[PDB]
Amino acid sequence: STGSATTTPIDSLDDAYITPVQIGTPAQTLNLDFDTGSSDLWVFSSETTASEVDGQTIYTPSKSTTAKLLSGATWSISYGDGSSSSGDVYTDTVSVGGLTVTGQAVESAKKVSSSFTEDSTIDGLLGLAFSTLNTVSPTQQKTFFDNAKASLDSPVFTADLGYHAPGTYNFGFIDTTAYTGSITYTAVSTKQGFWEWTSTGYAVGSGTFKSTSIDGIADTGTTLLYLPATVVSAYWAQVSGAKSSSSVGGYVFPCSATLPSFTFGVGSARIVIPGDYIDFGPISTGSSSCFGGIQSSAGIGINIFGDVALKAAFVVFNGATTPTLGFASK
């Protein structure tokens, strides 16, 4: 089997991407944030504290003839950005772009933190990291991909995120028309439960490539590119007026600037992030100070190849017995 679904930026800055997901019978379609950095499929629901729901579409398990309460099961998750949610668990039928999993753990939120409430466009998350990170207790549950894998034509999914435009998540096949050149594959460590890999280096604009190993995670659920302070300083030094602002919480730059590109290495291959991808717009409405899309990972504890990086590539998440990651230009 295969599946193919369009993923759409939630706003004009590509702050996140949503993908429609069918849950239950009859189908209830919710727009989920596909997140290769976590492993829980959770949704706003009829069980969510009312004051914590503001415009989201909710899953109502009582209206699904295939929903079953998973007895005794609860979940609770805290993300790297300080947001959180928790609740109970149902199993139900879940379909993405024509690919159907029966008996999928659907984690129903009773509580969500303010940043989830405040974002009316995201109805929940669909985790695509390794199932070892799943938070369901006392019986850990499998991700959508893990449940689908055996039935897929090939045990892979691909992320093709657009810049200020829709893109695609495919399951079970590689669309050879969706990229240019070849896909370069690189090793993955699953020891932390993430799609963790090692970039071979970087370049700033038209500058020379610096060969240096940068370990980090391929994370569709993180907006920006978080890299070591040395690398980030080298980038922003090429933008006149750019500075790190502790009050704002990262590098800012004059909105009048033309940003240089940023290149990262995948083996001997190179992915080029155009400068415009690195502009996240005014820090507050009306400001002429703009927020940078490349930020320091210092004190995150990990480097994160988030949407800023991933959207410059066609990315293969190969979930074979020994997983790997593939990157192509597009």
Side-chain angles (χ1 to χ4, degrees), residues 1-62 64-67 69-109 112-141 143-148 150-190 192-242 244-330:
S1 61
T2 64
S4 182
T6 298
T7 191
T8 302
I10 64 165
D11 63 22
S12 63
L13 301 174
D14 300 347
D15 279 316
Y17 298 77
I18 50 173
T19 309
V21 176
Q22 282 70 51
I23 308 173
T25 309
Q28 300 180 38
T29 301
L30 275 64
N31 296 326
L32 303 190
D33 186 349
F34 282 25
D35 182 13
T36 61
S38 70
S39 305
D40 288 52
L41 194 175
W42 75 259
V43 298
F44 277 80
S45 77
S46 54
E47 299 179 331
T48 309
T49 299
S51 63
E52 297 180 349
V53 185
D54 191 8
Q56 295 82 7
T57 295
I58 65 168
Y59 171 57
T60 304
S62 63
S64 173
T65 57
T66 42
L69 184 64
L70 186 61
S71 183
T74 60
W75 63 280
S76 177
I77 192 161
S78 307
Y79 297 101
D81 62 2
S83 69
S84 62
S85 51
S86 59
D88 54 18
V89 189
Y90 291 82
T91 56
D92 209 340
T93 302
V94 171
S95 301
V96 177
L99 170 66
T100 300
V101 169
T102 60
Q104 174 67 45
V106 177
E107 300 172 37
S108 167
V112 305
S113 64
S114 55
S115 63
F116 288 116
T117 299
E118 289 160 359
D119 184 3
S120 64
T121 68
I122 291 173
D123 302 326
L125 270 61
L126 190 149
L128 291 168
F130 293 88
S131 290
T132 52
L133 298 176
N134 179 264
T135 77
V136 177
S137 178
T139 308
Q140 190 171 64
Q141 299 296 303
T143 70
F144 177 80
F145 179 53
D146 221 323
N147 283 322
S151 304
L152 296 174
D153 289 0
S154 179
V156 305
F157 66 90
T158 66
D160 178 10
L161 301 179
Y163 166 68
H164 294 352
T168 307
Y169 283 101
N170 289 330
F171 292 82
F173 72 106
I174 287 159
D175 180 358
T176 60
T177 71
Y179 58 86
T180 63
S182 69
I183 306 177
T184 293
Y185 290 86
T186 196
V188 165
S189 173
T190 64
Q192 296 188 82
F194 298 122
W195 292 92
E196 188 170 3
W197 65 290
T198 300
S199 170
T200 49
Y202 70 96
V204 177
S206 63
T208 60
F209 187 84
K210 176 75 169 177
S211 297
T212 183
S213 296
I214 307 174
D215 297 338
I217 66 169
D219 187 5
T220 59
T222 291
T223 310
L224 305 188
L225 174 54
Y226 295 89
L227 293 174
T230 49
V231 179
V232 176
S233 179
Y235 179 80
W236 290 109
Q238 300 302 312
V239 180
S240 195
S244 184
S245 169
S246 53
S247 61
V248 175
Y251 281 89
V252 299
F253 68 93
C255 292
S256 62
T258 298
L259 296 178
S261 64
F262 183 89
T263 300
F264 65 94
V266 181
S268 57
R270 307 289 180 253
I271 300 297
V272 179
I273 306 170
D276 289 354
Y277 291 26
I278 297 161
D279 187 343
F280 279 73
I283 61 175
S284 291
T285 305
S287 180
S288 70
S289 184
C290 273
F291 199 68
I294 297 179
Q295 297 293 347
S296 177
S297 64
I300 287 176
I302 195 166
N303 301 307
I304 308 173
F305 293 89
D307 299 335
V308 164
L310 302 182
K311 77 175 77 173
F314 177 87
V315 188
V316 183
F317 293 80
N318 168 27
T321 303
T322 297
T324 61
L325 278 170
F327 291 84
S329 294
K330 66 187 183 190

